From a paper:
The [name] sialidase of [name], one of the bacteria associated with severe periodontal disease plays a role in virulence. The C-terminal catalytic domain is preceded by a 160 amino acid N-terminal domain that is a CBM that our laboratory discovered is capable of binding various sialoglycans and non-sialylated derivatives but has no catalytic activity itself. The [name] catalytic domain (residues 197–552) folds into a characteristic 6-bladed β-propeller catalytic domain, with each blade being composed of 3–4 antiparallel β-strands.
Author numbering:
A (entry chain B), B (entry chain A): 34 to 552
Amino acid sequence: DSVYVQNPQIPILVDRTDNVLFRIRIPDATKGDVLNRLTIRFGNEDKLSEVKAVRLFYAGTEAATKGRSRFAPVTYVSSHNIRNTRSANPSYSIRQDEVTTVANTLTLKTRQPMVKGINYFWVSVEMDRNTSLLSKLTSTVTEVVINDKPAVIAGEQAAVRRMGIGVRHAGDDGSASFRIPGLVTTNKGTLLGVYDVRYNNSVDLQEHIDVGLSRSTDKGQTWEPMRIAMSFGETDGLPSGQNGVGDPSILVDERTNTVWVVAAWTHGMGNARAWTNSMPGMTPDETAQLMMVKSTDDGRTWSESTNITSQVKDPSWCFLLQGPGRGITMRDGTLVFPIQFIDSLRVPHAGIMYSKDRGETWHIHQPARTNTTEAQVAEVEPGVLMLNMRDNRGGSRAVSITRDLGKSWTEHSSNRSALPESICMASLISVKAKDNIIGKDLLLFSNPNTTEGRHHITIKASLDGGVTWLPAHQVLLDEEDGWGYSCLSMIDRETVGIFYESSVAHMTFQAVKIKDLIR
Amino acid sequence: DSVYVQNPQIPILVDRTDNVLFRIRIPDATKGDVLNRLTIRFGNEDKLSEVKAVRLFYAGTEAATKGRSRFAPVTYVSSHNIRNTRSANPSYSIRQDEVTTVANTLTLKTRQPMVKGINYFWVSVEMDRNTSLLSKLTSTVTEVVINDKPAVIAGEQAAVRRMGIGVRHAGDDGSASFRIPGLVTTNKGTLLGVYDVRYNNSVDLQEHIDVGLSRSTDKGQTWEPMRIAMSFGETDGLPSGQNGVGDPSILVDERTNTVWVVAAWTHGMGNARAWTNSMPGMTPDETAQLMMVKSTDDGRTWSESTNITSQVKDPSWCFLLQGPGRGITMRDGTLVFPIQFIDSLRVPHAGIMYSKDRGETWHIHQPARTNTTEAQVAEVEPGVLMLNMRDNRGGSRAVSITRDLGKSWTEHSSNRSALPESICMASLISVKAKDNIIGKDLLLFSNPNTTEGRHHITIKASLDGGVTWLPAHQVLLDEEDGWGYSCLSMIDRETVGIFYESSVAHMTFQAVKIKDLIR
């Protein structure tokens, strides 16, 4: 007689067989009670054309000790099961009904007798594989009938659901996992997404890891098969498991359209984490190496790797590597990659590395802040670089300014205040007024918008050079748990792309109108 | 400088492509040093004709922080990787050499330049797939040559290596894992091994779990395809993930050769552990159910399950189930299964359940001991049952006697003293004097022979009804880490079979001459 409905703010993947539209908790069932039918309604303006099917599933009951406020006993659609990331695990969910032609009103039926107490049902939505990434569903459970009486419906279920595409799922092309996203838009409008290909498992370097790249010439609707942008196989006769390269950062040289990918090659180091096992020195046998590849053909083919360690690594550092995600071209044509180093006393520092000669030579000056790691840089105003930093103190992003490419650093007003975090990679980009439909300079930022865990992946916009991030100028994309790393790139004048580790896929692409951010 | 050699006491699987014969640590290498050649010698009476090939692998180096005493950076041959349990992970080991015709002396070569410090090599043995399970190798590294100088060899490498067979590997027939072994020998000499088929992962009930059975009519050399002995699929319209059955115990009714399998069916309980979520009551919706199948055709086909719960479960118990492993026929024809119950206050007790009518009706009297769980029972003398118990107090097995089928219990002299454990399932069987080649009553026991972790799987024999377990009357089978559950059954007059979770496979069978136990 009382039913609870959840409409979870998570991406509907156009390439998935099942996506969670509604979770339903019937908390106080009498044994034998039957959910005869439930009615969904879609909003007037919904493009029901590109909805392929809607399914009602039963998932049984809850454990006696797990309490009465959960919407599921288990993950319905796994983002980690290498054998199935695309459909509901059939061992957790039994299909009751299915409609393959969707109208604005829709009724699903069961004859399943319920157990005493908590019973779980959910609604799966399957989209046409060619569904527009910019499409939205406004769906409501309007009627639930139990023992031929309409039941009282409760819960927040007014979420506007967005589409996305699982560019990489766990198990794709034999790889256990994919991590550490980077995204740029080439001068030809081509989306380039980079990531770790983590073949054996999901652990950080050292392991068998290559740098993968997914390419889209249609604003993310389709992605060309995975290219290996960088790999070290059995270099020097050491196993591929002791020759990993990863934590990639990608940038487009906007003057030439030359694309650059920088990454950390770990050589040796047993089967342990490079973060604590990379040591002082310069040789591949001694310390992690800073490796770069380039594409001169819009990311279709990739150069052999060049070793730039000798140019920029201090011998006393335990570890120098890029900040994962992306770098930038500045207005004066300087290429800038965020970097991070562990000093002789094992203290991490964020900073920047830049080339003034199209990527021929690279320079690092002074660190921005102590006990920071992963950082992303934007040119917030001409000749003014904002470094936005993961901070081991917890709670909030560190923000510093350089006007001299990291020779000197100033604390920004927004430092350790404006942007909450849980100690996790975050994306920051600048959008020039002339390059977007708002006609105003923007900063766009994405991270897990929480001080604990990795969830509530959110795009935030600032109109005042990242002094203020108004709540209204934010879109929630993924309220469920994931590995939390993300990277932003403007797709065109009207839309921002996010390439991120989500609750629905290891590498998830979504496109968001900047008019949804700034209303 | 010196080199260190390990000959690990782990099973050589006749069905594996790779098995670790030797691990080698070269601790203090100069960059460029080359292990030119390595000589192994086999004992004069070794059956080298059933050795198919020997391989030398390089595995690179060690992590800076992991110290100097390890024999490997990583597991070389995985017992968990659903994509490969049978050959070395090629990302961790590079083959240097291979000999396919094995003599008493054997030389393996490399041209691999070593890194400064620690370098790992290992020797893989592949056996003929028809290799005798009773065969042994006595192998030693006699020469290691580096830079054309013989190096000083150190280490304990005098192990007599035994054969085994991986009856179930992780991933077999689509199942993530296999756990909880039981083994009997039918009156026809047929080996019947039962186990959890844990489809989704390796967690305990509640989950998608069936009872599997492997059958061998040739004393374990070959195993028939896996049969599902018990399964509840989508009973009552609940998902298979909320209809698991497992923790099996198997016995042969020696009077009739009727084989019986008892198991715990969990219905509902969300995706949580039944151990803490099974609750008082009697119905499948309320509490775990005690379910039984039988085979009248030597384990080829299995009856539909009968529900025994009403006969033996007190309503106030949170959980009644069998002790995993096996039950017995007593000399007077009584069938006995070890059982365990959680009382109304969540305190576990071990006991016995018996049938005097060929398995028609079952009875439980009094528990043996507070805060015990998994137990195995043997008829040490006519009408005298020894219950050997997992004890939550830690350190050692509890041992009690009943002469009245558990109405009353006496502490045995060996109680909480003679048999070390880490709080883990253990196997105990009795062998009558007339039924074995020693012509003496035996007790045989197997468990991880440690107070910490699960390793050193060992068969122990007692000649004095389990009063004493002399060190000499013990065989070490697996000194490396596993899940630790095991079950014993006499194969014939001369050999005991062990079906166990090992470091080399989820379900491992080995055969041991009792003349190796009692010398």
